[PDB]
Design a protein around this nucleic acid. Structure first.
Ligand SMILES: Nc1nc2c(ncn2[C@H]2C[C@H](O)[C@@H](COP(=O)(O)OP(=O)(O)OP(=O)(O)O)O2)c(=O)[nH]1
Ligand SMILES: [Mg+2]
Length: 641
DNA sequence: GCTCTACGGATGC
DNA sequence: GCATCCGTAGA
């Protein structure tokens, strides 16, 4: 049954444990976290919540043995200094010592080990959660109990009465359900080592271990570093943007109240519909009798401008309560950098394979949009609020149209490869063809509309929605659909091949092999089947783009680790002088790698990032990037050097 | 009958 | 009233 060995009680036992740890090439370390129970005696205070504390580690290199490395200050021969030195030495990789450390919730445990314990993990990582996601990307978030049930059933009764292993977070890190951190961490290590061995066998069966250990887990390490750095924030810039946005919101509200007389509430869809359709003419679209989406008011723009006022009000409100308040709320402070950063929580459990940041979402920050504030547009830019550290600069690296290049790779579209290799900007060409204007005289918003039209046609947009977005008839939209499909015959061939392969195999394989299972391809409902086909087409391209982005991130992290000898992260600086000099991955936009590169190495790291992103996994189409240097995320001036 | 994600407000059996 | 649904934003 349970077998926990206190390696911090006897000197000879400690030395034997250290020797066995050094001899072994695969660990299962885990973190024991309890309540304060009240500081500096019970253990290291974990950064963030002040009600939790770390007590020690639990290592299990096979079997039920759960050697517990106690970090408690209460064997006098083993002081904190020598114990921590041994822990760091055994957790440091050197002289080609292959060691696969297995850690549940690797990102959070890495952050805890660095920020509180001051221990820099440098070995390989084998997060069981990441392997579980790799097996079933579109499945729900893998709880500890879920992995134990689905991969290690025989060890299930060891979790008897352990209901704390249900809230996503590992039982080792939470402090509820009693179960003092010793037993919790030890049993957690026992569970995760064997479940990760089973996960490795399954990965070998599915031929997914190479991607798991070469790109997926190194990208998880890069995301951990991202979480320790965190995207920048300026506070004052966001305050100014909020003040201007609120002033414009008040002006719009007063103008609308003057126009319509009464004080109808914008937030109420029923009130808006009543004041628009059944009271002030404004014939409806094709209570809640009439739809009141953004598209409806956008269509009703040639009429009197109240729908435009409501659209501006809605956009400003969405920017002010969904993007401004969350940033001002979940905003931290970094005393070492002297500036107010904000650390998002990364999540790689997305369906296609992208990385999305929660609490808050830095990716869904609306870009620069002009506002009509009479006094010419103020061009409200709250991405301006994401300033880097003083003496640094954002070094964003956005791929030239990435799903297009990956499409041309996996289509054998001679036309598309020819167009993309010799830069022609397919989206600008589409805008020029649609609007009959010259390709050199197309605005940014027209370019974005053309890009969303092209991607829609790629991903099976219907004629009705195509005509609705493009402002043309159903027949004209269908004719445009056939014109686009015939122009790129390889794209259509790839679409049919994708649908056939997803129907035959039940899943779709990414460029490296991170298969996504789509049983809906066998659905009988026509809408569900069509959605499954479209999401399979989008998976093999979008997940491939995210996987290429992860490879580029891994390569850039490697190159900025060998070069620019310094701490690998701001959290590394906090745990363990001189000006800042490094890359410091801060944010990802599913095709764009924002880096908090210092001013001294702006050119060098810019060249390194561009080279490692272009020289990443190569296709029949050259992968182009547009490195943009900015004093913030707003003024990203082009950087072709 | 474009995809992926988050996320706050609106309904809701 | 948890529990989604829906509509907004980014890619
Ligand atoms: N289905 C769908 N996918 C999109 C859409 N926009 C972007 N994607 C994907 C394509 C790329 O993998 C990724 C990059 O989005 P961007 O806004 O940066 O456009 P893109 O990089 O393709 O071109 P650009 O940066 O303007 O030169 O997002 C869209 O409107 N629909
Ligand atoms: Mg791009």
């Amino acid at each position: 049954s349970l077998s926990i060995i206190d390696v911090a009680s006897d000197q000879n036992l400690f030395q034997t444990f250290i020797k066995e740890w050094r001899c072994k090439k695969r660990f299962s370390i885990s973190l024991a976290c309890e309540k304060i129970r009240s500081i500096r005696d019970d253990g290291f205070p974990i950064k963030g919540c002040d009600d939790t504390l770390v007590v020690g580690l639990a290592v299990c290199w096979g079997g039920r043995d759960a050697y517990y490395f106690s970090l408690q200050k209460e064997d006098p021969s083993l002081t904190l200094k020598d114990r921590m030195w041994y822990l760091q030495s055994c957790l440091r990789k050197e002289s080609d010592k292959e060691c696969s450390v297995v850690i549940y919730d690797f990102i959070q445990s890495y952050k805890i080990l660095l920020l509180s314990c001051g221990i820099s993990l440098e070995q390989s990582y084998e997060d069981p959660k990441v392997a579980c996601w790799l097996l079933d990307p579109d499945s729900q978030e893998p709880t500890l109990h879920s992995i134990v049930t689905s991969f290690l059933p025989h060890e299930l009764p060891l979790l008897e009465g352990m209901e704390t292993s249900q809230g996503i977070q590992s039982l080792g890190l939470n402090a509820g359900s009693e179960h003092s951190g010793r037993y919790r961490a030890s049993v957690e290590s026992i569970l995760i080592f064997n479940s990760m061995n089973q996960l490795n066998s399954l990965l070998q069966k599915e031929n997914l271990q190479d991607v798991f250990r070469k790109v997926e887990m190194p990208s998880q390490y890069c995301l951990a570093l991202l979480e320790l750095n965190g995207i920048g924030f300026s506070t004052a810039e966001c305050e100014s943007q909020k003040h201007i946005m609120q002033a414009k919101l008040d002006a719009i509200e007063t103008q609308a109240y003057q126009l319509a007389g009464h004080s109808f509430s914008f937030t109420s869809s029923d009130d808006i519909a009543e004041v628009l359709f059944l009271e002030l003419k404004l014939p409806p679209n094709r209570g809640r009798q009439f739809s009141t989406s953004k598209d409806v008011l956008n269509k009703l723009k040639a009429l009197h401008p109240l729908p435009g006022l409501i659209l501006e009000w809605r956009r400003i409100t969405n920017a002010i309560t969904k993007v401004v308040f969350p940033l001002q709320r979940e905003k931290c402070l970094n005393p070492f950098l002297g500036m107010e950063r904000i650390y998002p929580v990364s999540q790689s459990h997305t369906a296609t394979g992208r990385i999305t940041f929660t609490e808050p979402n830095i990716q869904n920050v609306p870009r620069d949009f002009e506002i009509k504030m009479p006094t010419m547009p103020f061009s409200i830019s709250m991405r301006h609020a994401f300033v880097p550290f003083p003496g640094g600069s954002i070094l964003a690296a956005d791929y030239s149209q990435l799903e297009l290049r990956i499409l041309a790779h996996l289509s054998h579209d001679r036309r598309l490869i020819q167009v993309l290799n010799t830069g022609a900007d397919v989206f600008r060409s589409i805008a020029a063809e649609w609007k009959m204007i010259e390709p050199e005289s197309v605005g940014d918003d027209l370019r974005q509309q053309a890009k969303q039209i092209c991607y829609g046609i790629i991903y099976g947009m219907g004629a009705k929605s195509l005509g609705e977005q493009m402002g043309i008839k159903e027949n004209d939209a269908a004719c445009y659909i056939d014109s686009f499909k015939s122009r790129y015959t390889g794209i259509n061939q790839f679409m049919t091949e994708t649908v056939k392969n997803c129907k035959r195999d039940g899943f779709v394989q990414t460029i490296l092999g991170r298969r996504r299972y789509l049983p809906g391809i066998k659905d009988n409902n026509p809408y569900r089947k069509a959605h499954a086909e479209r999401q399979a087409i989008n998976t093999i391209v979008q997940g491939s783009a995210a996987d290429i982005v992860k490879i580029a991130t891994v390569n850039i992290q490697k190159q900025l680790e060998t070069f620019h000898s310094t701490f690998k992260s701001h959290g590394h600086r906090e745990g363990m002088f001189c000006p800042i000099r490094g890359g410091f991955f801060i944010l990802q936009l599913h095709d764009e790698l924002l880096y908090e590169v210092a001013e001294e190495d702006v050119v060098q790291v810019a060249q390194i990032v561009k080279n490692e992103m272009e020289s990443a996994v190569k296709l029949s189409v050259k992968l182009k990037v547009k490195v943009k240097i900015g004093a913030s995320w707003g003024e990203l001036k082009d950087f072709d050097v």
